[PDB]
């Protein structure tokens, strides 16, 4: 997998060497094709994993993501052509390159055989992200948000560093292939009960768990649209990908060491879903929607039943695409409105007829409408959770009712009701804004036709 | 909706606004017109008497026991008109009342057709900018001395001037864009 | 009460302007400048038959062909009928006592 990567690196030379006026089209047009080369990995004609080479591999779980990581770079660069079009021609070429490095790094992290290669690349992605959030962040508080995003991930990260070096000494190689075909069975000691927490905690932090998710609402609030898309679509899912590949070892402990997180997540799912119900900042509501719909995932990567896992793989890819779509349209309202407040800007369909159709489809993806991969995902996690304990439906049942309420409230108070009297007149929709959306949903429609590709390792 | 709300309400407007709620809440209980036109001229009688009470205290003691008699003898589902707040068509057609400052972002192609329309629209926009100065100055030269200030706005008071702040009472979306 | 003599002129005048705005809203002749079949038989067949063919192509050459794609409750056989394939004549039922 060096075509999904080397051609990517070369994007950096192109963003720099290219003309200031033509820099945007060379980069966006080329990475669209970079995504097309990424699609070749999907050609798996047998169940064996495609080990491209010693360090680089792609199995069913990584492949559905590498393609998404390559896909969003085009979109990210199309959603940030407006803001970042007021810059000095060298601030742009920095932002474009920053976005380019994220998927170079993220493509490799999702396509990495050695778990510590994951760690080095895993924690590197913070550098590009923190720059995108802090350097271009509009609000006074991004310095703070950046600190929260760096420390919560970093304090979790050093325990994983110690744990992975620890298993290398215990087993003798951090190669995901071998670690899988070798006998690593923890022994339920008090210490192992700590190892397990060391490995999972760093992944559980960037996958916002109810206890440590305050970093994500603060980060996406002041982050520029491209950073918020990256955090929701690819960055948070880095934590999920890690939990799937790391729990191959630590096989016995999670049977009983998971209860704490599972309950934290399911109760967390309800409270995070509910506070979405009365949050005035739209970007705030989407972020907590992201916490709740990701709290379902940590509760399926821990129950560990075949269906959970691919419920997880289905939902992660699906929610990634949906969340960005929501964060992308939130930005289009923010740029014309100039405020994140949900109460202002009422009645837009009256003035932006189509964006409202995109808003409606994004919300229906947000809630579980049935001919969507989003629902298949939740339906499956719901099933397994029920298997874990029939009572789980109650808590995963209060979340579904709340999820319907906030998803439609975003449509009802932003895209319906009487028009706002006279905010700065709202200029019509650009074709870029609409495509950036179409590019998010057309793939959501196509993937829903053949869900098999994003089903995970389990199935 | 047009005129501005008075600060405090008088005795009269409180009495005379019960005569409306009352009679109108008597046409829910008494639906047939005859029964109504009967049971209602009997209502006026109630208000007709106790009309000349000069004893304010008393008057405000007949009013406060009238509006409690009424609250307990009101109809739960009165007859509120179709297009009035609380009605059945209230704000129905508002999905078609776009705010008119939106025809300014139309593509030169769209505005190409419908041409005489925009020829008259550009006249009115000249009227609006041609008076903002004389208006705001009027609004100010005639601003009240410090003290009670109501939301009532002044008329023109000079030829050529246009009533101050007139761009959104005129140029207001048509009630039923249909 | 009664309108204040200076509010029956701000409604006097502004109504006069609203009347002109609504006149201006009226469209002139030419205003909507336009930028430079057997009845139901063009439908019944074109819009129903054309689809039908395709469907049939699909149902008689994919579904029918694939296993367990169009399954049907057994046909009903009563006392006395002749099964087409076997030719078996379902035996008549015990006479139930008539005129019960």
């Amino acid at each position: 997998m060096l075509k999904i990567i080397l051609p990517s690196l070369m994007l950096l030379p192109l963003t720099w060497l290219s003309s200031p006026k033509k820099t945007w089209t060379n980069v966006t047009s080329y990475s669209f094709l970079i995504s097309l080369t990424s699609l070749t990995l999907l050609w798996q004609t047998d169940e064996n994993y495609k080990n491209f080479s010693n360090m680089f591999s792609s199995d069913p779980l990584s492949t559905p993501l590498i393609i998404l990581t390559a896909w969003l770079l085009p979109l990210m660069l199309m959603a940030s052509q407006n803001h970042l079009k007021k810059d000095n021609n060298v601030l742009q070429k920095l932002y474009i390159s920053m976005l380019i490095s994220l998927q170079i790094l993220l493509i490799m992290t999702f396509s990495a055989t050695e778990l510590i290669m994951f760690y080095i690349l895993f924690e590197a992605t913070l550098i590009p992200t923190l720059i995108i959030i802090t350097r271009w962040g509009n609000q006074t508080e991004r310095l703070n948000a950046g600190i929260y995003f760096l420390f919560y991930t970093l304090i979790g990260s050093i325990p994983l560093l110690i744990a992975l070096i620890l298993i290398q000494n215990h087993v003798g190689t951090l190669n995901l292939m071998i670690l899988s075909f070798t006998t690593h069975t923890l022994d339920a000691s008090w210490s192992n009960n700590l190892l397990w927490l060391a490995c999972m905690m760093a992944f559980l932090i960037k996958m916002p768990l109810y206890g440590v998710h305050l970093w994500l609402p603060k980060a996406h609030v002041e982050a520029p649209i491209a950073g918020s898309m990256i955090l929701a679509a690819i960055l948070l899912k880095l934590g999920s990908y890690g939990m799937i590949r790391i729990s191959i070892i630590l096989d016995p402990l999670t049977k009983y060491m998971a209860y704490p997180f599972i309950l934290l997540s399911l109760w967390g799912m309800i409270m995070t879903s509910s506070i979405c119900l009365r949050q005035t900042d739209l970007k705030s509501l989407i972020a907590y929607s992201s916490v709740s719909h990701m709290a379902l995932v940590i509760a399926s990567i821990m129950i560990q039943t075949p269906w959970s896992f691919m419920g997880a793989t289905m939902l992660m890819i699906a929610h990634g695409l949906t969340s960005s779509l929501l964060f992308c349209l939130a930005n289009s309202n923010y740029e014309r409105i100039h405020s994140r407040t949900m109460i202002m800007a009422r009645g837009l369909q009256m003035v932006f007829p189509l964006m409202a159709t995109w808003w409606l489809m994004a919300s229906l993806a947000n809630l579980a409408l049935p001919p969507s991969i989003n629902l298949m995902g939740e339906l499956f996690i719901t099933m397994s959770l029920f298997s874990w304990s029939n009572f789980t439906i109650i808590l995963m049942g209060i979340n579904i009712i709340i999820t319907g309420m906030y998803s439609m409230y975003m449509i009802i108070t932003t895209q319906r009701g009487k028009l706002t009297n006279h905010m700065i007149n709202l200029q019509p929709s650009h074709t870029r804004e609409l495509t950036l959306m179409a590019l998010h949903m057309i793939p959501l429609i196509l993937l829903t036709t053949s869900p098999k590709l994003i089903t995970g390792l389990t199935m | 909706a047009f005129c501005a709300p008075p600060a405090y309400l008088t005795h009269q407007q409180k009495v005379l606004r019960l005569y409306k709620r009352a009679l109108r809440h008597l046409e829910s209980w008494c639906i047939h017109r005859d029964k109504y036109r009967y049971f209602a001229c009997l209502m006026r009688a109630r208000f007709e008497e106790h009309k000349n009470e000069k004893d304010m205290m008393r008057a405000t003691q007949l009013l406060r026991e009238a509006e409690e008699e009424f609250w307990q003898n009101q109809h739960p589902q009165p007859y509120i008109f179709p297009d009035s707040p609380g009605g059945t068509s209230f704000e129905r057609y508002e999905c078609y009342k776009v705010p008119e400052w939106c025809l300014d972002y139309w593509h030169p192609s769209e505005k190409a057709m419908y041409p005489d329309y925009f020829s008259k629209r550009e006249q009115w926009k000249k009227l609006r900018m041609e008076s903002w100065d004389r208006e705001v100055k009027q609004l100010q030269e005639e601003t009240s001395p410090d003290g009670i200030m109501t939301e009532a706005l002044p008329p023109a008071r000079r030829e050529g001037d246009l009533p101050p702040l007139w761009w959104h009472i005129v140029t207001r979306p048509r009630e039923r864009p249909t | 009460s009664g309108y204040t003599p200076d509010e029956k002129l701000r409604l006097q005048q502004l109504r006069e302007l609203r009347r002109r705005w609504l006149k201006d809203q009226e469209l002139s002749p030419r205003e909507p400048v336009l930028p430079p079949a057997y009845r139901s038989s063009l439908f019944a067949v074109s819009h129903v038959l054309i689809p039908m063919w395709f469907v049939h192509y699909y149902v008689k050459y994919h579904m029918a062909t694939k296993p367990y794609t169009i399954v049907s409750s057994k046909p009903r056989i009563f006392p006395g009928d002749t099964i087409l394939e076997t030719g078996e004549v379902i035996p008549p039922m015990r006479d139930f006592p008539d005129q019960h």
Binding site: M350, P353 | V98, W106, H107, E110, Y114, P177 | E26
Partner: peptide
């Protein structure tokens, strides 16, 4: 008396 019906710009 056909009347002009204001509408959001619908070309974009």
């Amino acid at each position: 008396k056909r009347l002009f019906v204001v509408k959001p710009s619908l070309y974009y």
